[PDB]
Ligand binder design. Structure first.
Ligand SMILES: Nc1ncnc2c1ncn2[C@@H]1O[C@H](COP(=O)(O)OP(=O)(O)OP(=O)(O)O)[C@@H](O)[C@H]1O
Ligand code: SF4
Ligand SMILES: [Mg+2]
Length: 310
């Protein structure tokens, strides 16, 4: 099943000198119990697509065009009365360094309460302790010690565990995670990934997560979506991506993983057509005159590249 269809998503950042065209025309289908990874280098639009999808864009960011369908109904253009029932309950989002959203003069139990309260639902404080403890366990934490401690007393690994437990609180059907594992030593990064695998199996959920490390994606993901300068450049299954990477940018990555000449594109003044052309070794005239069309190819596979066709 497709649990989420992103259709033609244009979302930009309004800035003094014009617009920032991160997330520029973005269409992809999330399989209903999959793990999809969104991958790309620093400052390439990952968090921007995530935010656009969740209507969590800053005051700054504005959505120009497109739909996102959950259960065939468009999240953008939804009555906030109809949005509030979908939020933590169904779709849930632990965002880039949401640790910072943990005010540190507060016991964790309070960030749970704050969350629960905010999203409507009314639970007896003791009941809340129950549920919270339960998900804290799911994430392999000491419910007692943790709920009753202050953020500052927790490791980044533990803060991360807490954040996830928080997201799971209301048994969501989709869980979305942004750079879940960055700023986080090797080992504990490994433990988070393990944990993510555990919950993957132990729960019935669609899991979308963002990362800049392809390795991490292949550790975790079924399908993989590569983004380059505000564009969805390619979308295959993990194994296929490594086996048969289509976009020249992607190929480059995979090879560079067995160090690509060029600098990343200005997102204010991007290059024309295919933003990868200035670095692409297969660059052509049509590549500068025209944005390659997002296309379907063979099986799970999608590319946006002039080299290819139906
Ligand atoms: N509120 C904003 N206003 C203007 N520009 C922004 C805003 N937020 C992000 N950008 C810019 O748009 C580009 C894409 O940012 P985004 O956060 O989507 O990248 P990313 O893929 O998350 O990479 P990273 O997370 O490592 O920064 C970046 O250059 C970023 O600085
Ligand atoms: S579209 Fe043209 S430039 Fe962009 S990657 Fe495919 S070939 Fe290289
Ligand atoms: Mg990011």
């Amino acid at each position: 099943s497709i649990i989420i269809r992103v259709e033609d998503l244009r979302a930009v950042y309004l800035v003094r000198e014009g617009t920032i065209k991160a997330a520029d025309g973005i269409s992809l289908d999330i399989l209903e119990n999959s793990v999809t990874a969104i991958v790309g280098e620093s400052a390439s639009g990952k968090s921007t697509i995530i935010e656009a999808m969740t209507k969590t864009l800053p005051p700054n960011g504005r959505i120009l065009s497109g739909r996102v369908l959950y259960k065939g109904k468009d999240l953008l253009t939804m009555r906030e009365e109809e949005l509030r029932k979908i939020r933590w309950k169904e779709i849930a989002l632990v965002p880039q360094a949401a640790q910072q959203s943990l005010n540190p003069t507060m016991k964790v139990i309070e960030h749970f309460k704050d969350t629960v309260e905010a999203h409507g639902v009314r639970w007896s404080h003791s009941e809340l302790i129950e549920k919270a403890s339960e998900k804290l366990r799911m994430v392999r934490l000491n419910p007692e010690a943790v709920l009753n401690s202050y953020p500052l007393q927790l490791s980044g690994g533990m803060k991360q565990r807490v954040l996830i437990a928080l997201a799971l609180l209301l048994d969501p059907v989709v869980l979305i995670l942004d750079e879940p594992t960055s700023a986080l030593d090797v080992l504990t990064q490994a433990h988070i990934i393990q944990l993510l695998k555990e919950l993957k199996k132990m729960l019935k959920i669609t899991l979308i997560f963002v990362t800049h490390d392809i390795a991490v994606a292949a550790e975790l993901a079924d399908k993989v979506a590569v983004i380059y300068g505000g564009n969805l450049v390619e979308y295959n299954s993990t194994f296929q991506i490594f086996k048969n990477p289509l976009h020249p940018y992607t190929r480059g990555l995979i090879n560079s993983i067995m160090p690509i000449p060029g600098d990343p594109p200005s997102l204010l003044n991007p290059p024309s057509g295919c933003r990868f052309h200035p670095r692409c070794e297969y660059a052509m005239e049509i590549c500068k005159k025209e944005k390659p069309k997002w296309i379907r190819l063979d099986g799970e596979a999608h590319v946006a590249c002039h080299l290819y066709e139906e």
